Symmetry: none
Subunit: 176 residues, 6 copies
């Protein structure tokens, strides 16, 4: 949570870095959410891709294409969240080990062929991520950062929407 703060490195070309209009503790609150959400988004991209590549069965086209649509929707938020953190005097992480540590979403290491399995996995992730943005929006606003909060409201709407579609798809006993 403090591993994202880059205003006190004391290193070259870092002298002017500060937390703009946010107090130290407010930045701590916001930066925690930004770094966490950044790792999560990137991880969702990788996860959607993995399932995108490994899916097989009669619902191959449905999920393979849907995953890319979902990726297109969330991809822009990767750069947006990272630079928002930067604009606040923070440094975004992007290394595999940092992704693994801060992401609320785990990317599979196994080959998942089964459709219900991928979907249920994704649906649980999205419920968690969607509520995550709702809660982070409120936290940021309280932390006096309506700007980041605003960004989260948009992201939230997108996650919630994707959540609905995937949940709808798996709400079927004939699926399997």
């Amino acid at each position: 949570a403090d591993h994202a703060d880059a205003a006190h490195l004391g290193t070259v070309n870092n002298a002017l870095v500060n937390h703009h209009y946010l107090e130290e503790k407010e930045f701590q609150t916001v930066a925690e959410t930004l770094q966490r959400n950044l790792a999560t988004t990137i991880s969702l991209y990788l996860k959607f891709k993995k399932y995108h590549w490994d899916i097989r069965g009669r619902f191959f086209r449905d999920l393979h294409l849907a995953y890319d649509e979902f990726i297109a929707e969330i991809f822009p938020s990767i750069d947006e969240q990272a630079e928002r953190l930067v604009a606040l005097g923070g440094s975004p992480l992007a290394a595999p080990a940092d992704l693994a540590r801060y992401s609320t979403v785990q990317v599979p290491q196994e080959t998942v062929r089964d459709a219900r399995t991928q979907v249920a996995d994704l649906v649980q992730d999205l419920s968690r991520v969607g509520k995550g943005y709702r809660d982070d929006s409120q936290a940021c606003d309280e932390a006096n950062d309506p700007v980041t909060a605003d960004m989260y409201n948009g992201y939230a709407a997108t996650i919630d929407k994707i959540r609905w579609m995937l949940q709808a798809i798996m709400d079927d006993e004939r699926l399997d």
Copy 2:
């Protein structure tokens, strides 16, 4: 190298998977290069992004924009290499831990402000990656896979080109 083979899982919806026109050992040769290059490309994307976000100094615009241009050039190869592996009866990895293990490129975990530092780091990566594709192209062709080999020839030209630009930028004593 065998952790990429998905033709013998014996799991549901995997019965038809095979290595198309490649023999078992030929697939082993090709799949090694595909999974390795896949991890590397994704890692380059993350690395270019990290430096993109952390760069500061009078050359901020030059490198910040150049990194995005470079990303746009290599990004398409992520899906292309992964699905090429899939079309050959393989399963592409994408999880942070898999990226870390198979990538020939390491994504920084520290905040690098210095321009020469980012560049020299990237230049060494690209010399390695560029030659990597040249060597993998020859290997695949020998393995009777002129198709993948062809893909690598294109990727190689792009890496070599990016390598040149970054090397040119740092070939300056006044840089620092």
Copy 3:
């Protein structure tokens, strides 16, 4: 295989026709592959269309749309392969009877409603066509025609990709 050679017609406006930088036997090798692949591509277009038009059942949208996507991918190769043959002093065939004779793919004359049936039919075609291009690429290169060979490497990657998607779709016991 020699019915594609147009450099010795002795007819009007044919005096300058020759096999460019290829020897007579080399052209024979290349032209065989070009005319065969031309007939095959056109036949695949017609076949994808036929199934596109006749499919019914709960997977109508999946296959009906996928077939058009696949067509869009291979269509450009029709003109490209035909004119490549022409640039080498050959004459491409396109008449129904020529298509039937040289194509490695047969277009159905019956109305196939069943999805597994269309798919399995197509998958077998693609395994054959995909390997066909791989083998023809090697043959052309040996025949001193790296140019045509290059064209085949690209086509091959596309066929192999389509092969994967269709095979994945039918790898399901619940399909039927």
Copy 4:
């Protein structure tokens, strides 16, 4: 003419097929024209292509380019006519042997270099096809199918237009 009717196959996934608002004999009348015109259009595409690829002489550019323009104009009608037949409970043919049987246009199997020859050949085809659509439009309307009839009126205008241009080109004694 009855080989196009697919409402009585009694096969799987065919139970709901019927002739919509057309009586049995009316469908017979319309389907005859649809299947015939479908084969003809596809055959015109192949023929325009063949001449496109084989033309030589000082009028190479004129005809080579004109043929592609003409193809672009009629190509869309291939899918449109086939699916119109389908929407009426019919099954469109597309196999080489079916094309050869129902088309009013024959695709050349020989290499035609001569310009006047290709043109005169095409002009006769178009006079026949153009009048064909005019007559089929009237037949369909009488058969209570103003919808298909409407489609033919459009196609007719396009054929008649192409007919004019080609006829104009060959109306020259200096041509040869």
Copy 5:
């Protein structure tokens, strides 16, 4: 052939220049082909333009427009070949005197009105250039540079195609 090597200038901002993954002799082989082809392409552009501007007669539109189409096809290769040379530690020449020396194509200094004359001139150039790329592709591959070789395969296909069209146009006794 060595006037293209820029890895040993010992001048400012040249310290890092090297031949990437190619040995010294391999670069010599590749660079010879790159500089030669670069001069040739630029010269073809100028030549196509000259004839484009000077053509007169009843075939003015055919050739004037065709020349621009041909230019559009080869133009991109100017920057591509030059930077490929650069990425390998070479320096591309572009001065008139360098063009004249290394080009396998000579740009006319006289006003050529006659169509057959321009065409036959161009056709001979293209046979030479087309075979040139075929031979250079093999040479580069042997020199362990499948990447440049790949670039040449593409260029070759374009030259061979243009060669065909122009040869076809002049294969006519009524031309003059």
Copy 6:
């Protein structure tokens, strides 16, 4: 200056060529400026490219990209000036030797790495070219050719603009 006049060749397909609404001496005045400016523009393109390809150092991105922007601005004028000459009964030169003779800009044959060097070289060229168009515009107008004059006014504005940017870049003691 008279090597550009093509109204008196007495050769085939040249019978109708004349100087439109310009008198013989007026054409001589205008054609001199047109051929000179044509050679110059083409030479600027080649020169911008050469420096584009050879630049190295910390200002690589600035100049490499700026040169292409500048090229895009002046490129259209190559065809425009050449055909303007043609419309007046002249024949544009384009051969390397003609470029070298009539251009007021010399393309480098050496590899220039240094930024100040390229820039100062270019700035001197542009001052010369910019004033060249201003003076040629007045000359043409006096020669009763407000049309060509108009073309030059536009070109002039573009050269003057490019001149400013490059001069601004080098107006720095820290450059080197």
